[PDB]
């Protein structure tokens, strides 16, 4: 069948290329609700996740931007304290005390 122009036109129509756009930034992993929900679960549950996707998706930056907005309870201060000149143990203190 001879495809008409209308059946072939796919480009969304412009109406003003002269109007600058002001848009709020999108949520991290926009259009990637599967990965976003997987990560929400892995974070809420403390599971180790793994992001899978074709290269150039920007997965690394979206992941960091998403984690930066998270907030965990303040982690305890971990440090190495020598119990002797040979034996050094791990000490965990309340945060800010080390």
């Amino acid at each position: 069948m001879r495809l008409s122009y209308e059946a072939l036109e796919w480009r969304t129509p412009i109406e003003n290329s002269t109007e600058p756009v002001s848009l709020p930034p999108p949520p991290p992993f926009f259009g990637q609700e599967r990965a976003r929900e997987a990560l929400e679960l892995a974070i809420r549950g403390g599971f180790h996740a793994y992001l899978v996707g074709p290269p150039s998706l920007g997965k690394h930056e979206a992941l960091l931007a998403y984690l930066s907005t998270q907030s965990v309870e303040t982690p305890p201060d971990l440090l190495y304290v020598p119990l002797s000149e040979r034996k050094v143990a791990v000490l965990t203190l309340p945060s800010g005390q080390e």
């Binding site: 069948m1 001879r2 495809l3 122009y5 059946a7 072939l8 796919w10 480009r11 969304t12 129509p13 412009i14 109406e15 003003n16 290329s17 002269t18 109007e19 600058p20 756009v21 002001s22 848009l23 930034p25 999108p26 949520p27 926009f30 259009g31 990637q32 599967r34 990965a35 976003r36 997987a38 990560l39 679960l41 892995a42 403390g46 599971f47 180790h48 996740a49 793994y50 992001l51 899978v52 996707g53 074709p54 290269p55 150039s56 998706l57 920007g58 997965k59 690394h60 992941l63 984690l67 965990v72 303040t74 305890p76 971990l78 190495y80 304290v81 020598p82 040979r86 050094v88 791990v90």
Partner: protein, 426 residues
């Protein structure tokens, strides 16, 4: 103690450690990392030069590891039952996004956050180009770095502001910068070194549309010919049997043979042998899928049907004659349009492509303008019989139909070979 260096494990305590599986196995680290995660503790890496060193207590692992990589990277890691036991949550990224006004606005916001100055037209053009990249009409490409790279080039070409014209220029330049091979090909076509019929009719030859391997993103037409001779029912694909093609069966040859054998049964076998060949060896033939062009060329050779040459034919076909979608349909259509426009648009040139590929038909602006002007035609077919009806310009059924002509040609070939049998007895 004061010489222990903090690693990623220590810097991530009570947080998240984002690794790269590609880097984990490129550096053989994944095994020790897995032992650490399973054990929940790790001591820092020591040197083999230590007499007795220190008795470091193993550092507790209190992070959440989040591996990142491509599916190929994780394929080599998801074999052991420990991986799937440690990393139970799989956050997979679709290589495409639903092409919706919401995703267009989200891309606009993402670009603004990246620093670009967009206009509505420029955002629209970038969104359309993302869809073009996805090769799908209703899915935009999810590769946001690639859209950002194109946006950077458009900002440069437009003075920092991404207007519609600037994005169009960026896309045009991106094509032009890789257009050398096609430039040489079009020069060969115009000078006559490569002779393509884009007008008139011819028997047993058609303009298939191929993607070249020298540039696996540019489509161009290829004259594909089929010659029918009396003989055994075997179908020769010269370009698949040019060495290493005799006792290695080709799924494409088997498909074409199955279609032809099952479709025309009025003799104990196909009384004809069809040789299919591409001239112009720039064709990267695929011995894994029979081409619709191959089938229609074979049918024209058999029935002596003068197919239209102004129409190019693309699309795979299965042994039932159903036309299957093919990859790079945009590249192929635009390549044939380039060739036709070079030789001058006759006003009747076109492409016969699978209707299965209508979801992938995101054609360049010039092809669409030619279509709207009626200078270029796109025919979507579902069956090889439909493609043959369009090419030969006649119906299959009825009197003076293509099917009866093919049966007549097969009858003539059968008569010639049974006349060889006449000689065999006499």
């Amino acid at each position: 103690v004061s010489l222990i260096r903090p690693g990623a494990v220590h810097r991530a305590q009570g947080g998240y450690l984002i690794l790269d599986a590609l880097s984990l196995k490129r550096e053989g680290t994944w095994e020790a990392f897995k032992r650490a995660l399973r054990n929940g503790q790790v001591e820092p890496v020591t040197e083999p030069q230590a007499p007795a060193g220190l008795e470091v207590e193993p550092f507790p692992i209190q992070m959440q590891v989040i591996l990142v990589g491509t599916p190929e990277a994780f394929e080599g890691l998801e074999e052991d039952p420990a991986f799937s036991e440690l990393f139970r949550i799989r956050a997979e990224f679709s290589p495409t996004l639903p092409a919706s006004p919401e995703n267009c606005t989200a891309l606009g916001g993402w670009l603004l956050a990246q620093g670009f100055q967009l206009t509505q037209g420029g955002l629209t053009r970038l969104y359309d180009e993302a869809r073009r990249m996805a090769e799908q009409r209703d899915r935009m490409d999810a590769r946001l770095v690639e859209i950002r790279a194109l946006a950077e080039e458009a900002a440069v070409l437009g003075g920092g502001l991404l207007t519609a014209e600037s994005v169009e220029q960026a896309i045009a330049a991106r094509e032009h910068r890789s257009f050398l091979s096609e430039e040489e090909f079009l020069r060969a076509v115009q000078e006559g070194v490569i002779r393509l019929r884009t007008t008139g009719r011819a028997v047993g030859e058609v303009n298939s549309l191929v993607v070249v391997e020298a540039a696996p993103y540019w489509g161009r037409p290829a004259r594909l010919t089929a010659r029918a001779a009396p003989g055994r029912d075997h179908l020769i694909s010269i370009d698949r049997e040019a060495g290493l093609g005799g006792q290695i069966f080709h799924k494409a040859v088997l498909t074409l043979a199955g279609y032809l054998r099952s479709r025309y049964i009025e003799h104990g076998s196909l009384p004809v042998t069809i040789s299919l060949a591409f001239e112009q060896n720039y064709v990267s033939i695929e011995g894994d899928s029979a081409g619709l062009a191959e089938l229609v060329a074979a049918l024209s050779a058999i029935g002596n049907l003068p197919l239209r040459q102004d129409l190019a034919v693309t699309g795979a076909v299965d042994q039932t004659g159903k036309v299957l979608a093919v990859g790079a349909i945009n590249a192929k259509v635009e390549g044939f349009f380039r060739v036709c426009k070079a030789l001058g648009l006759s006003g009747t040139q076109g492409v016969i492509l699978p209707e299965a590929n209508l979801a992938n038909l995101t054609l360049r602006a010039e092809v669409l303008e030619a279509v709207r002007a009626g200078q270029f035609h796109i025919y979507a077919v579902e069956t090889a019989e439909q493609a043959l009806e369009i090419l030969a310009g006649a119906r299959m059924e009825g009197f003076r139909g293509l099917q009866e002509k093919i049966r007549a040609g097969l009858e003539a070939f059968a008569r010639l070979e049974e006349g060889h049998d006449k000689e065999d007895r006499e």
